[PDB]
Amino acid sequence: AETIRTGGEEVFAALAERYRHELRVHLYRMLGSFTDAEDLVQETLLKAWRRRETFEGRAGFRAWLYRIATNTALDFLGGPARNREVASALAEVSWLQPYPDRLLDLAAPAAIARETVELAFLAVIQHLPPRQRAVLILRDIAGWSAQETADALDMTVASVKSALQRARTTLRGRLPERRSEWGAATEPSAAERSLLRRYMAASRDADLSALALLLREDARQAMPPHRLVFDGRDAILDLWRPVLEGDTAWGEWRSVPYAVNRQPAAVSYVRRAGETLFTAVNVDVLTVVDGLIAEITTFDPGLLPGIAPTLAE
Numbered sequence: 001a002e003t004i005r006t007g008g009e010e011v012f013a014a015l016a017e018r019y020r021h022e023l024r025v026h027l028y029r030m031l032g033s034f035t036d037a038e039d040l041v042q043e044t045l046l047k048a049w050r051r052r053e054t055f056e057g058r059a060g061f062r063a064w065l066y067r068i069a070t071n072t073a074l075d076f077l078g079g080p081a082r083n084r085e086v087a088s089a090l091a092e093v094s095w096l097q098p099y100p101d102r103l104l105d106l107a108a109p110a111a112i113a114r115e116t117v118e119l120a121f122l123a124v125i126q127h128l129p130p131r132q133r134a135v136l137i138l139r140d141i142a143g144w145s146a147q148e149t150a151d152a153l154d155m156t157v158a159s160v161k162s163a164l165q166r167a168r169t170t171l172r173g174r175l176p177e178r179r180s181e182w183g184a185a186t187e188p189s190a191a192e193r194s195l196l197r198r199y200m201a202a203s204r205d206a207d208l209s210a211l212a213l214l215l216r217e218d219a220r221q222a223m224p225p226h227r228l229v230f231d232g233r234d235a236i237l238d239l240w241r242p243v244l245e246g247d248t249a250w251g252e253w254r255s256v257p258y259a260v261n262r263q264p265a266a267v268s269y270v271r272r273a274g275e276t277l278f279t280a281v282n283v284d285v286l287t288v289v290d291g292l293i294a295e296i297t298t299f300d301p302g303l304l305p306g307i308a309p310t311l312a313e
Helices: 020-031 034-050 061-078 101-107 119-125 130-140 146-152 157-171 180-184 190-204 208-214 233-244
Strands: 215-223 228-231 251-257 265-272 278-289 292-299
Touching (some): 020 034, 020 061, 020 101, 020 130, 034 061, 061 146, 119 278, 130 146, 130 157, 146 157, 190 251, 190 265, 190 278, 208 215, 208 233, 215 233
Antiparallel strands (some): 215 228, 265 278, 278 292
């Protein structure tokens, strides 16, 4: 559509429905939060309906919507969310939520790759000031030129280039280097699904020795919403052992696979003494390299959209 948008009208939210899902993932890279991104796409689409005469036709509807969305993110991040700048980044991004693979698949701009949605990546770019975030995301992920970026953000091209450089510099050296194939994954791999099954089975069967064999020596389990981090395999094993073994053990465990951010993940469920169903405990998102868990990022299912609170057996 080139100019039908002001003359024709109710076919707007129909046309904007095409880009809704990409826009939400874009907002989620900036924000780290699925619910905040959903709130901000609805606002973007509302604005785009209102500000309907602003579209002149330079770079198309999607670039115009991307411009609106990005500046709406920056408004949020300069106002209410101004304090959301981290100075483990994972363990400190308490508003971080995962993004289900099923919903990522609806949002291809060529599917979205692990490179651009992986939790460690999203956490580290919460280190960047909001405008640096928009420059990095728009240039290195959305494929915008420096001129396009500068126009969207009311900056100069030199500003954009320098900001991109300070962004790429902070990001490299704070993000582990991933193999190109790992970063290209558009779903967990057969090897990752297989480890995930041994991970779930370690809770089902209260099998710490098996769990230890799954963990890198320097593995971290971070819990961003609870601002807790457990550094090293011994720290993780000390956390789990009283939950699974002995007089302290909570109960019996079952888990459900749940791909998010192109990573293997499982929702764990516990059934305590006297209970009939299992109740959701943790969403564990594994970072798996070479058949070893390098990181576990753990969220609360109740605080997240979309997760069955109980299961039957």
